[PDB]
């Protein structure tokens, strides 16, 4: 079991597709100095399968609402980026090793650690209450996270500021799902 085979499978565990199988990705021989780094590197997939499933499960029912969907949609432009980096890495496997991969995927282990922990803090939040629970992640100070979440807020809070600029200049609120904080009585 060479080192080139593990790099062949790891580039697929980064997506969810499983030597390395499926909560840790227990690998099943080879030397101990290899299994440990594989277990560590594969931790990026378990952060990727969870975020993709959340966006998918919610992209099925229309019960989430306009604010929720916007946040869910914002989780795809931050996944195309993760789907591009893999393509450049994939073209070099034809040289890179596990040590080289660590200096490559050290940053996207953080973005895939805020997003994979931003979709759990706001689970049942439907409507503006979601745009208020992705704003409670800006009080963090970390200049790398406070400048990422403060961008998803700029997309999630666009539908909210769409009702507001409607319910102020025209006074015609319209939301079949109850999101706006102004509730009308028939």
């Amino acid at each position: 079991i060479t080192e080139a085979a593990l790099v062949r499978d790891i580039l697929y565990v980064f997506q969810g597709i499983d030597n390395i199988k499926m909560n840790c990705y227990k690998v099943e021989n080879l030397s101990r100095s290899l299994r440990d780094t594989a277990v560590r590197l594969s931790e990026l997939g378990w952060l990727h399968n969870k975020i993709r499933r959340y966006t998918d499960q919610r992209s099925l029912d229309r019960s989430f609402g306009l604010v929720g969907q916007s946040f869910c949609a914002a989780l795809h432009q931050e996944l195309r980026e993760y789907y591009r980096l893999l393509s450049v890495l994939h073209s070099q496997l034809q040289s890179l090793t596990l040590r080289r991969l660590l200096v490559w995927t050290y940053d996207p282990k953080i973005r895939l650690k805020t997003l994979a922990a931003l979709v759990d803090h706001c689970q049942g939040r439907k409507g503006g209450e979601l745009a208020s629970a992705v704003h409670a992640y800006t009080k963090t100070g970390d200049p790398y996270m406070r400048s990422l979440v403060q961008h998803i807020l700029s997309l999630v809070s666009h539908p909210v500021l769409s009702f507001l600029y409607r319910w102020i200049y025209d006074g015609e609120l319209e939301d079949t799902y109850h999101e706006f904080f102004v509730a009308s009585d028939p």
Binding site: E81, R84, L85, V88, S91, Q92, Q94, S95, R100, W104
Partner: protein
């Protein structure tokens, strides 16, 4: 050959005194260089450009290399 190339480079950059100074100066790994370039790009940030640079480096290998990369990094 190398001396002629240096003279041509000095001419492109621009005389005899400058060429003499260049001659005196002349008379006077790859993975690490790539990591340093990525770190410099991060400081500049930006992130998208760094991803493109990694793809470009792989293409160059597919088609010495460390020395060329170091000169480019110095120019910044």
């Amino acid at each position: 050959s190398p001396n002629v190339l240096l003279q041509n480079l000095c001419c492109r950059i621009l005389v005899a005194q400058q060429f003499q100074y260049a001659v005196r100066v002349i008379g006077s790994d790859e993975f690490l260089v790539a990591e340093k370039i990525k770190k410099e790009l991060i400081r500049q940030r930006r992130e998208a450009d760094a991803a493109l640079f990694s793809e470009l480096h792989r293409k160059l290998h597919s088609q010495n290399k460390w020395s060329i990369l170091y000169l480019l990094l110095s120019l910044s």
